[PDB]
Short mmCIF file of N, CA and C in Angstrom, two decimals:
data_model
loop_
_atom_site.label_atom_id
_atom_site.label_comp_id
_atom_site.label_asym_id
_atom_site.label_seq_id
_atom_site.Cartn_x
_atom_site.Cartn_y
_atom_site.Cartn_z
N UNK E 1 0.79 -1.22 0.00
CA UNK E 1 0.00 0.00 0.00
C UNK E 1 0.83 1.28 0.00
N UNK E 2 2.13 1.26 0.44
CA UNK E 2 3.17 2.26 0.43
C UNK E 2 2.58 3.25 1.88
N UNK E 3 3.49 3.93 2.46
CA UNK E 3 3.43 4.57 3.91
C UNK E 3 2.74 5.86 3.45
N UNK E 4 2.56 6.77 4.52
CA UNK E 4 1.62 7.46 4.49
C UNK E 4 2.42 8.57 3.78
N UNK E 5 3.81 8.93 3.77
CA UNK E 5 4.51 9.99 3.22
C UNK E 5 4.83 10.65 4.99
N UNK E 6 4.13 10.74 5.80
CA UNK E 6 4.45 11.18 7.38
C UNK E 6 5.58 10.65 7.28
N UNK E 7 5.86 9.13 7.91
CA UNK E 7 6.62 8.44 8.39
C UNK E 7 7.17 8.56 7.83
N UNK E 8 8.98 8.55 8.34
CA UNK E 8 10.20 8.32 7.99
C UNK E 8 10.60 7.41 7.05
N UNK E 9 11.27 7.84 6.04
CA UNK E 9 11.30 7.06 4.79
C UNK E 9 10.74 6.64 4.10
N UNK E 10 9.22 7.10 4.17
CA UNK E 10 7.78 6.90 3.16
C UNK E 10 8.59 6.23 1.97
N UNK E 11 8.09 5.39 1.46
CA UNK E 11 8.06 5.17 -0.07
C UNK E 11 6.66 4.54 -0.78
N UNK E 12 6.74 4.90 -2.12
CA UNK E 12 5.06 4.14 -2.62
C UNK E 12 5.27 2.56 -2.84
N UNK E 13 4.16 2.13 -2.38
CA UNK E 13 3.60 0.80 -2.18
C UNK E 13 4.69 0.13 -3.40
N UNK E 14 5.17 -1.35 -3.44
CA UNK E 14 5.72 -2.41 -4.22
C UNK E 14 5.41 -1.99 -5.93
N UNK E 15 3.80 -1.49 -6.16
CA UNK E 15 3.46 -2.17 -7.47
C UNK E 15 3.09 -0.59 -8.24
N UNK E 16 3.62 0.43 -7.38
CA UNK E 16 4.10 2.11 -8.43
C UNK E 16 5.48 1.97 -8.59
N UNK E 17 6.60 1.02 -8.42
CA UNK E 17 7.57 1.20 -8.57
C UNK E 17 7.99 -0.12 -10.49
N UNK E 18 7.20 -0.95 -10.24
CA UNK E 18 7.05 -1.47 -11.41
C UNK E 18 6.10 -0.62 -12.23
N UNK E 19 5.07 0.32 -11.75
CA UNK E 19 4.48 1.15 -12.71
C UNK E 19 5.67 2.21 -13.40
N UNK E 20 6.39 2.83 -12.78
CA UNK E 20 7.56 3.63 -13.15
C UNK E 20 8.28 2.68 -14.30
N UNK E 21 8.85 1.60 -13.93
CA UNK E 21 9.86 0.98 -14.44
C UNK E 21 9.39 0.42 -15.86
N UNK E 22 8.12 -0.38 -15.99
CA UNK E 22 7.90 -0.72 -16.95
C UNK E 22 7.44 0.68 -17.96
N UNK E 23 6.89 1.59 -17.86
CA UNK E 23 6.73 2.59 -18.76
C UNK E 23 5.27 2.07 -18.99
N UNK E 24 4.22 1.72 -18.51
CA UNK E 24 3.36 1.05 -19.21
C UNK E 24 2.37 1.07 -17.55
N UNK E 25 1.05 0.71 -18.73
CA UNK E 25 -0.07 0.34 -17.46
C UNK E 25 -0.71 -0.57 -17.85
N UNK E 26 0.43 -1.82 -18.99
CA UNK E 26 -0.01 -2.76 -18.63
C UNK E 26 1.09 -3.64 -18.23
N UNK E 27 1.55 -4.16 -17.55
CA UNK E 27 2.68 -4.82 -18.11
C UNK E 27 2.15 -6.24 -17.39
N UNK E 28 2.83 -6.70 -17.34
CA UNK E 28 2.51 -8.83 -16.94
C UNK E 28 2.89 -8.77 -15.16
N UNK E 29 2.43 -8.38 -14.74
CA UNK E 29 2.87 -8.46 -12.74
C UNK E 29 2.28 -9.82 -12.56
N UNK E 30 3.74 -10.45 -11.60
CA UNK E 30 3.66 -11.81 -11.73
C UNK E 30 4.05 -12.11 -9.91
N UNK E 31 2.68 -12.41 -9.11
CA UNK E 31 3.12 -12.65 -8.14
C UNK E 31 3.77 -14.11 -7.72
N UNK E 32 4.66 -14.24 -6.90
CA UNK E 32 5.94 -14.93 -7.20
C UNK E 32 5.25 -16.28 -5.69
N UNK E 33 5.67 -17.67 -5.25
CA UNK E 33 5.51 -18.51 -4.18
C UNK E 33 4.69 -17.91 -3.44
N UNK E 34 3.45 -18.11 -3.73
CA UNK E 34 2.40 -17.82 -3.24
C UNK E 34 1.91 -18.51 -1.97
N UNK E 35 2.48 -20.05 -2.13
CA UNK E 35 1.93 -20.84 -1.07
C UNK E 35 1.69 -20.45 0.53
N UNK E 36 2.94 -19.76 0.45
CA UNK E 36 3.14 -19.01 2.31
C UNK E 36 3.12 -17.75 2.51
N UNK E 37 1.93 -17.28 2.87
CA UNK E 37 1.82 -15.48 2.70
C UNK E 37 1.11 -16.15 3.75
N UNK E 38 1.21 -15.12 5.14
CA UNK E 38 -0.25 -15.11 6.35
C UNK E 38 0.52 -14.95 7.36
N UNK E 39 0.25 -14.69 8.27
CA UNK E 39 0.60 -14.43 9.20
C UNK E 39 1.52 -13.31 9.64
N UNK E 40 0.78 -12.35 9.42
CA UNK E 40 1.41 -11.13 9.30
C UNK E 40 1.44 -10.17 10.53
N UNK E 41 2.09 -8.92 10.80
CA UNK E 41 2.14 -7.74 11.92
C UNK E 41 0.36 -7.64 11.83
N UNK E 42 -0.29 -7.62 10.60
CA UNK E 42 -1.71 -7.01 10.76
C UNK E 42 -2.94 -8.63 10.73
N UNK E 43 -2.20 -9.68 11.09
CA UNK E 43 -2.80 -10.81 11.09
C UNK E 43 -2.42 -11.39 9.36
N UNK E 44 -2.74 -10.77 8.44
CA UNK E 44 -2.29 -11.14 7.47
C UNK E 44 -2.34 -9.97 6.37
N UNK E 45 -1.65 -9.57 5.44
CA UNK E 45 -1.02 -8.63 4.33
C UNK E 45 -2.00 -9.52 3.49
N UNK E 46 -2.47 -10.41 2.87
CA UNK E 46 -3.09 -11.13 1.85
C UNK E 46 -4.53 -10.39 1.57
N UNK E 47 -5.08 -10.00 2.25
CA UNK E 47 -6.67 -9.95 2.34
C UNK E 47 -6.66 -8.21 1.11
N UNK E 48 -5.68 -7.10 1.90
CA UNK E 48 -5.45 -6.40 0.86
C UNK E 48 -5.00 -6.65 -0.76
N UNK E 49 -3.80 -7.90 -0.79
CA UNK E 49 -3.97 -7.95 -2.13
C UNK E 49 -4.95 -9.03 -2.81
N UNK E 50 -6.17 -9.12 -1.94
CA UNK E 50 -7.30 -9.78 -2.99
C UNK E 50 -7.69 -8.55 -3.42
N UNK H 1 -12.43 -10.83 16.80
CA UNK H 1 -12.78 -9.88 17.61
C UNK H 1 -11.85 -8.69 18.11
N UNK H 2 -10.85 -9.32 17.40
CA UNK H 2 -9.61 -7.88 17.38
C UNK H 2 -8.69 -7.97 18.98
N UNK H 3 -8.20 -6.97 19.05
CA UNK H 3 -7.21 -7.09 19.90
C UNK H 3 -7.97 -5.24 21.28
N UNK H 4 -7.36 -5.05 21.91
CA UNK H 4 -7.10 -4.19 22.88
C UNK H 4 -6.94 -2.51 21.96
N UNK H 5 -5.50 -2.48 21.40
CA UNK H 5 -5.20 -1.50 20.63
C UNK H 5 -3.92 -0.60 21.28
N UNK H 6 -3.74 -0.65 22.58
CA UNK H 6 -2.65 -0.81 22.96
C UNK H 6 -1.60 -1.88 22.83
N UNK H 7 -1.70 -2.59 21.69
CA UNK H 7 -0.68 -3.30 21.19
C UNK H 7 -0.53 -2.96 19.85
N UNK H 8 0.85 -3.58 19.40
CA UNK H 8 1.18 -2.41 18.41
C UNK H 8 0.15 -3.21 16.51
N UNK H 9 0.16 -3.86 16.45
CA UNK H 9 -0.52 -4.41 15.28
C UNK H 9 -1.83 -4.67 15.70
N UNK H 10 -3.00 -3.91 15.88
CA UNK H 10 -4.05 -4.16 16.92
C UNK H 10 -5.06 -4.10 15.13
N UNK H 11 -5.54 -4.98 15.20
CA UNK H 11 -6.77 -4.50 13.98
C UNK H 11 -8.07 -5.15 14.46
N UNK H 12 -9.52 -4.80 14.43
CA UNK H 12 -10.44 -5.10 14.72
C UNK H 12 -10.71 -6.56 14.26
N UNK H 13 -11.66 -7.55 15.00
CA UNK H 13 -11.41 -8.95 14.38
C UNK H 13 -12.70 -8.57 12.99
N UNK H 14 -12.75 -9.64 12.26
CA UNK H 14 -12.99 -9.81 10.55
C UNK H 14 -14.22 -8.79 10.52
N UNK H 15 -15.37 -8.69 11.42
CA UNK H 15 -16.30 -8.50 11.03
C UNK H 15 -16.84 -6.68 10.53
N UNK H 16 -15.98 -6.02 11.98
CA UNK H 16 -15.78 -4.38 11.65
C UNK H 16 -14.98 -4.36 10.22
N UNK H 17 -14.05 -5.00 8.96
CA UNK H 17 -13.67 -4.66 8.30
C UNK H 17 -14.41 -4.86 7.70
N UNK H 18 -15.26 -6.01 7.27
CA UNK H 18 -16.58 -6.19 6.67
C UNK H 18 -17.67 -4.81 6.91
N UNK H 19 -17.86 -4.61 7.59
CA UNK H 19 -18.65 -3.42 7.52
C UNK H 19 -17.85 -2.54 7.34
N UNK H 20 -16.37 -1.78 7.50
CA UNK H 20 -16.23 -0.97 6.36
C UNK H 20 -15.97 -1.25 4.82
N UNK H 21 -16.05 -2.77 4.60
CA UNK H 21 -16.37 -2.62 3.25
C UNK H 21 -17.32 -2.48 2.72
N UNK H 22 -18.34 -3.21 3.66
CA UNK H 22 -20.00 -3.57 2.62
C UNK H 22 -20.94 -2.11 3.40
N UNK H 23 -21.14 -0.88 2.68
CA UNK H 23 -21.45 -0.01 2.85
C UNK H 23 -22.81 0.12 3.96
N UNK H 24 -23.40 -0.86 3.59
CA UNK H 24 -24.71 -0.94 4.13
C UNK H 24 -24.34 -1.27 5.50
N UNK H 25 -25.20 -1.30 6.59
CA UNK H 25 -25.26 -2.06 8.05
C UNK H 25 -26.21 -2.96 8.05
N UNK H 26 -26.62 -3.38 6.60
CA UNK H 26 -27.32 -4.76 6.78
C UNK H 26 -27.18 -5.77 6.06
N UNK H 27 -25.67 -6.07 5.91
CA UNK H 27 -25.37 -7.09 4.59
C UNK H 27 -25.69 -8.43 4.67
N UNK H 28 -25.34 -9.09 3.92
CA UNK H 28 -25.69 -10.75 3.75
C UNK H 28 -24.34 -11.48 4.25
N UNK H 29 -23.40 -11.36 5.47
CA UNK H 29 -22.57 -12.22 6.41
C UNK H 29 -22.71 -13.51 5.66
N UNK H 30 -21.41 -13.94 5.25
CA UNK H 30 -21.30 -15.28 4.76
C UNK H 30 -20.21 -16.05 5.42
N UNK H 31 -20.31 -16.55 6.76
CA UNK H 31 -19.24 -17.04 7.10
C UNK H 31 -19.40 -18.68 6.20
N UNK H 32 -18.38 -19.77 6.22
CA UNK H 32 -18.41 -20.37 5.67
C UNK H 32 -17.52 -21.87 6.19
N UNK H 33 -18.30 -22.90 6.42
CA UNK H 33 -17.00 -23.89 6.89
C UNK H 33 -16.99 -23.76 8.55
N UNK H 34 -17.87 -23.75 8.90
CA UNK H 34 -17.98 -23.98 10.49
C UNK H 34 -17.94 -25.15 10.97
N UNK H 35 -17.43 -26.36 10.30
CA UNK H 35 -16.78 -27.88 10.38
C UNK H 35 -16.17 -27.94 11.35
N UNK H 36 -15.21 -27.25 10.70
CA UNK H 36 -13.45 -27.60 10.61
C UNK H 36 -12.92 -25.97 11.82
N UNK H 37 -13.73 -25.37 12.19
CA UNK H 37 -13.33 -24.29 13.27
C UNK H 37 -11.88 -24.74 14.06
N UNK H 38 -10.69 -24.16 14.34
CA UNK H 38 -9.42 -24.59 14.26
C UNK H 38 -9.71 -24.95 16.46
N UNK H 39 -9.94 -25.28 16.92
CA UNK H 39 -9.92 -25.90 18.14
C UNK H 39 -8.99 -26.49 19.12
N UNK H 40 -7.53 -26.60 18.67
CA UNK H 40 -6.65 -27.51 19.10
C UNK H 40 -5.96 -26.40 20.14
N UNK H 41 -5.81 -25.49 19.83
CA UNK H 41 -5.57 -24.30 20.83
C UNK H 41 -5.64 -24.17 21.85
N UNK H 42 -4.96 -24.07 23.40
CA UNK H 42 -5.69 -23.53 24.76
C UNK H 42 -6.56 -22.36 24.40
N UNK H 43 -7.95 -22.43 24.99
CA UNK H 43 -9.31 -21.86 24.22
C UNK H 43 -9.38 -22.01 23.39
N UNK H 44 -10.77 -22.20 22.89
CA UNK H 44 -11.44 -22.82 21.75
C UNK H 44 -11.95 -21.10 21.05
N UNK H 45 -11.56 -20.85 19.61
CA UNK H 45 -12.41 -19.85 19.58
C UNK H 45 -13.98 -20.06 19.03
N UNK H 46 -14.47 -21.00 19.18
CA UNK H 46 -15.52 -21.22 18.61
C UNK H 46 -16.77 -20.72 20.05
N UNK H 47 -16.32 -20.81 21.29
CA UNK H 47 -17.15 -19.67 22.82
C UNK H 47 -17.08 -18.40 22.07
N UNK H 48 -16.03 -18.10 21.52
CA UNK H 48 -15.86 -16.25 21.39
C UNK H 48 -17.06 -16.67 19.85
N UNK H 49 -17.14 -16.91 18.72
CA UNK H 49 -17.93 -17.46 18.23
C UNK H 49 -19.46 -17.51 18.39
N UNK H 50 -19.79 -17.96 19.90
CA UNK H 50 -20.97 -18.40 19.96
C UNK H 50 -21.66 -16.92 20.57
#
């Protein structure tokens, strides 16, 4: 989701930095070993990227 | 049912996020798979549940 810009060392979320890089709004985003995502600081990070 | 909030990853348990997603305060709750409720735990959460 990227930090709020407050906090120290803000940066934007994982998937504006492949928006930059590829030049494009479409490109192929390929999420990578999916099997073990859960259990996260917020119970789990997964539920946002459904 | 969430946590206190004086801890540092505190998020409300499933159901307050559900209502800030599903706009209404009278949605159609689909829990699903009340079988298999995970039980092996000291406390059962299936009391907090009931």
């Amino acid at each position: 989701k990227g930090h709020r810009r407050t906090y120290v060392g803000a940066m934007p979320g994982k998937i504006i930095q492949c928006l930059k890089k590829t030049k494009t709004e479409n490109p192929l985003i390929l999420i990578d070993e999916v099997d073990k995502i859960g259990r996260g600081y917020q119970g789990d990070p997964s539920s946002a990227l459904l």
